[PDB]
Structure 1
């Protein structure tokens, strides 16, 4: 039952839009929204909602794909589905992350180009699940034709890293507290040859700090599950998380997580990856030592002195150092006086902070060590020629309390959104001019340069923070003052905080919303200083793992006569964006449907907010107004000559002699441009004549 003008979409105050002209019933649950006759905000919203209602969580929208978290297991990821999707062109199968992986694989061998699968989304949208599903597809496909084979190690690298780098947050039960770029290397002929992982900025603060509604890293609770009681024995620890201050400040148990089963999965991954018992037990020992380290009490003799060595002893053993030397490093750290040393004094406040810093440094360096070890086994020294990189960053997040870590996370999300903007809206139209195509530049209003420049550019939030660290008499309020004196009333995206709920220092108009930031401790977080007397002990440690985590350590440079976290983050992020530009990108935009992890429920305003700040509608219009398929006149002649037997003057006669809408294609300098769908008709016609 449908009428052309009686069925119309009308705006709403509670559900965004309620049942602009509606699309005919033939376009219900359409696999590509660039084929809809009417393209408007509720037409896209309702098609996604209609497909989502039938557990169709993927939908193409122009050249990229959208995906809505089902919050339930669906039978769409089986090896039957994997093997079936192999070879299938995008239009010859329903929308899926498997179809993106296979088509990126096809472009890689066809164009002899490296590919990238860039997966966007808010915290909990589904980036990590979709990333693991890309890796799954490639490994399952390569497998067709103790420590396991390359394909199994590739698969098991993610549960092993998730134990130490994932944690429960208010928005996600398995939140990635670090970004990763996985490169899957292929030979000249297309065989899977090798893989590597590059991790970016692990949330160190989480090791020793938790907000009310969140857990520390999964690993702590997995060990405390007691499913491996030999671990509790080895680590000299109890089975109660509330006995360790570093790990029990917020939540301790997650309903969706069986910590006991996960401990087995984690251990099994280290096994398949080729980790020795000395390696595994060493990592467990350090995790255990970090728990003990947090329980070390101190007191005044201002000067701190140990208040009971019981926990200090347990940590010193798992680490392999003298307990008394560890306590004297913490309390009286050495100061270099040429070839001699003088102890500095530390009050209880200072020793406590120093202990926390060393615990976060050990944990972070253990994660970086583990990644290196995974890479060393994934390095097969087999012939490689190309790669398909997959980017799984920490998603856009807004907590009841936003600190430096959230700015680093949300900044990366802004950067990745700008990458989408530049590629889809700037580079695409620039190609229409390059190929001599008739094209009026369309301003789609997709440019976050204002917010990006506010954070990364000189005299921006991060540049201000970087200089301020290099001042010994600089306080949190001098940093806030410099931030305000430079940006309030000058930077449109920098505003006064819009505040019972934790006090905020400033506001930031991010692409996905206004985030209230609190600048307390940003100066100390960016500097990241360590008690080098203890790190020196770490270098001499009798536990090979602890000695190697700190062997590369470069201390505070020697003084002469007469590097920050944010600086390294921008440096990494810029190196990432410049390298991604040399690849063919495939965008997968993940949409979190509702706040309460409810399977099948779709919050129309939350969905519409995402589709808007992502630029889904804008990205659909450019595909509809332009010519998404482009073929070189030589390659076109090679393949479609069969339809009706100079490369351009041949393609001109051939296309005019065929029975097609002659307005659906335009001629470029070196390529013939086709509109949406027309390429499929020519391939269908070639299939009719090849039989």
Structure 2
């Protein structure tokens, strides 16, 4: 029936379906009666599994939710929601990404094909060529939402398309770039078995005529901590376990290592084996990528060797001679050999680092705690610089002579996360997520409406309540969290509790997003809460000062410069601005570069905590849609004018409909006036015609009929 089919709220599944008898029979048999305002209307059965939710008769939270659920139940993981797309992780291989599908998607306008990541990529390609404007596919979502998978699919689309008309070709190299970086930059966290522990902006360059000419990858802050430290239910980087699988046994001999991960302390404090990952086939995938990318055998063995030496570096034991002196050089020797260093000099550098007395030097003393930190810090430093060397190396092969004119950047940041223990690297991760959401908010809600004003369109502003400046300002602005941290790791007599005290003194009761920690019994200790867009996060400030300073035993880095392993020497070649400072510098650099592109938002949704295919946790999925502003992003499309054409281009294409109607603007007034259309569905701007949602479809349908 018309009014019988309704949605009623539900304390366990957010909302549930109902049949009116206000008293109504629930989808699950519960005879429940509720308040008339709490009842939302179901959409007609013609809109079941709708490809675009802006086309629904009833727009509300359960109408969107149940449509997404319905599509997901038929394994339809892509859905349009106004000018952007939403995708729910299937946690399962679907046959929607083959070459035959890629080929079919080529050139098809959004409406001419089912919703898909291929359609986003293709239409970004058409906009780039048509408007002569750089494009950017911006993929959002928490840890394990599916950003990396969708990112790899955009590359796949472009690479397959460019092939239809180092060792490999530009297209294969662009594809293989991801398995090479994932090996060293991805790791199993609680939420994701292949969690991206770093952000990346991949630009795909095209010539004036659309030919794929080049590519570049820029990465953002890697989780160095992971190299030498793990939480209970997480692993170190993929590579360590892949190398230990022994699929390449020469590697173990070269790296002087056992096959047991539990032998190496740096890499075995959490988990070692992951059901989802076959570390052995993965090592082959890792190695193969390096070959296709043009990495020499010395280049490869140098990366392997440096990883190996890092493992031994962890097992370097130290004792009291307060002054530390070594406690067995066995592992210290294995590391120095692999690193092209003198083992005695490495240990003298560690236990007694120099202090320059003009042109002479005097050593300083170090205790076992000081040496153990120094040792850990140098391994993280190496790994970070090795990942950086590897990215520049990939770029060097991807950088072709070929002429470029445009680009399509694809942003794959590390997703929003909440662990049992959240520290500095969680803050940097969630900060980016907050920033990108605000980028969506500003583009979708602010710039959009300011275009209607610019064009002299009759429009009365809408406040969608989509603004995160308060929380962004708290983290980045002066006297914010990072500003306080930056100043504190400058005063040498500062402590974790002086930074914690300064944090509280400036924001407790002053900043609304800065709150006391909501510490629950058993869980690790936290110092403050941060009301982020996707949740409140309890951060622990222990060690943040040293994380931001990131000092190294300079005496050991000098031996690294002097190393007889070309790679290790060049990693520290220029060695001599805090972590958070460069993080904000890079983030602001990125947000402004994305301002100069036409953006394409792909919103990934994690369906459940248990990595369960087809299974949707209504509360969790709704929370995502809510903190993403999906319902707001659809409303601005329905309530506004999402489509607009210049008077010239409207004449050049649609004059055919009624050639009797032909000035460029006056002609469009006659053409639209003469056609049988709702004369409220279009408004005249200074230089453009503003179409209400759907009308442009009718006009392109009427153009095809002759």
1:118 aligns with 2:138: yes
How far residue 661 of structure 1 moved from its aligned partner, in angstroms, is 1.5
How far residue 4 of structure 1 moved from its aligned partner, in angstroms, is 1.4
User: In terms of mean alpha carbon deviation, does 145-154 or 596-605 score higher?
Assistant: 145-154
Q: Distance in 2 between matches of 1:460 and 1:551?
A: 34
Q: Specify which of 20, 45, 57 is matched with residue 25 of structure 1.
A: 45
Q: Distance in 2 between matches of 1:534 and 1:159?
A: 32
Deviations 1:485-544 (A, max 9, x none): 100000000000001110110000000000000000000000000001000000010000
How far residue 56 of structure 1 moved from its aligned partner, in angstroms, is 0.1
CA distance 1:201–1:108, change in 2 (3 Å): same
User: In terms of mean alpha carbon deviation, does 662-671 or 272-281 score higher?
Assistant: 662-671
What secondary structure does 2:41 align onto? coil
Q: Distance in 1 between matches of 2:480 and 2:658?
A: 61
Gaps of 5+ in 2: 16-38
TM-score under structure 2 normalisation? Answer: 0.96
Q: Distance in 2 between matches of 1:147 and 1:349?
A: 47
How far residue 675 of structure 1 moved from its aligned partner, in angstroms, is 1.2
What secondary structure does 1:254 align onto? coil
How far residue 638 of structure 1 moved from its aligned partner, in angstroms, is 0.5
1:649 aligns with 2:669: no
How far residue 685 of structure 1 moved from its aligned partner, in angstroms, is 1.0
Q: Distance in 2 between matches of 1:146 and 1:356?
A: 35
How far residue 449 of structure 1 moved from its aligned partner, in angstroms, is 0.3
1:564 aligns with 2:578: yes
What secondary structure does 2:265 align onto? coil
What secondary structure does 2:361 align onto? strand
1:682 aligns with 2:699: yes
Q: Distance in 1 between matches of 2:2 and 2:291?
A: 62
Deviations 1:369-421 (A, max 9, x none): 00000000000121000000000000000000000000000000000000000
Cα contact 2:195–2:414 (8 A) shared by 1 = yes
How far residue 108 of structure 1 moved from its aligned partner, in angstroms, is 0.2
Deviations 1:546-570 (A, max 9, x none): 00000021xxxxxxxxx11000000
Deviations 1:320-367 (A, max 9, x none): 010000000000001111111000000000000000000000000000
Deviations 1:601-645 (A, max 9, x none): 000000000000000000000000111110000010001111111
How far residue 101 of structure 1 moved from its aligned partner, in angstroms, is 0.1
Cα contact 2:319–2:368 (8 A) shared by 1 = yes
Q: Specify which of 614, 631, 634 is matched with residue 628 of structure 2.
A: 614
Q: Distance in 2 between matches of 1:224 and 1:366?
A: 19
Q: Distance in 2 between matches of 1:301 and 1:516?
A: 41
Q: Distance in 2 between matches of 1:687 and 1:612?
A: 39
How far residue 662 of structure 1 moved from its aligned partner, in angstroms, is 1.6
How far residue 167 of structure 1 moved from its aligned partner, in angstroms, is 0.0
Q: Distance in 2 between matches of 1:472 and 1:628?
A: 55
How far residue 145 of structure 1 moved from its aligned partner, in angstroms, is 1.5
Q: Distance in 1 between matches of 2:692 and 2:116?
A: 23
Gaps of 5+ in 1: 554-562
Match of 1:582 in 2: 596
How far residue 659 of structure 1 moved from its aligned partner, in angstroms, is 1.6
Cα contact 2:166–2:295 (8 A) shared by 1 = no
Q: Distance in 2 between matches of 1:688 and 1:635?
A: 19
Displacement over 6 Å in runs of 4+: none
Match of 1:557 in 2: none
Q: Distance in 2 between matches of 1:525 and 1:502?
A: 19
How far residue 146 of structure 1 moved from its aligned partner, in angstroms, is 7.2
Q: Distance in 1 between matches of 2:351 and 2:240?
A: 27
Q: Distance in 1 between matches of 2:695 and 2:490?
A: 60
Q: Distance in 1 between matches of 2:686 and 2:587?
A: 36
Give the count of matched residue pairs. 677
What secondary structure does 1:362 align onto? helix
Match of 1:635 in 2: 649
How far residue 681 of structure 1 moved from its aligned partner, in angstroms, is 1.1
What secondary structure does 1:60 align onto? strand
User: In terms of mean alpha carbon deviation, does 93-102 or 19-28 score higher?
Assistant: 19-28
TM-score under structure 1 normalisation? Answer: 0.98
Cα contact 2:166–2:397 (8 A) shared by 1 = no
Q: Distance in 1 between matches of 2:256 and 2:666?
A: 80
CA distance 1:174–1:239, change in 2 (3 Å): same
Deviations 1:447-492 (A, max 9, x none): 0000000000000011000000001100000000000010000000
Q: Distance in 2 between matches of 1:517 and 1:662?
A: 55
Q: Distance in 2 between matches of 1:435 and 1:98?
A: 33
What secondary structure does 2:298 align onto? helix
Deviations 1:108-133 (A, max 9, x none): 00000000000000000000000000
How far residue 194 of structure 1 moved from its aligned partner, in angstroms, is 0.1
Deviations 1:654-686 (A, max 9, x none): 111112222111111100011111111111111
1:316 aligns with 2:336: yes
How far residue 189 of structure 1 moved from its aligned partner, in angstroms, is 0.4
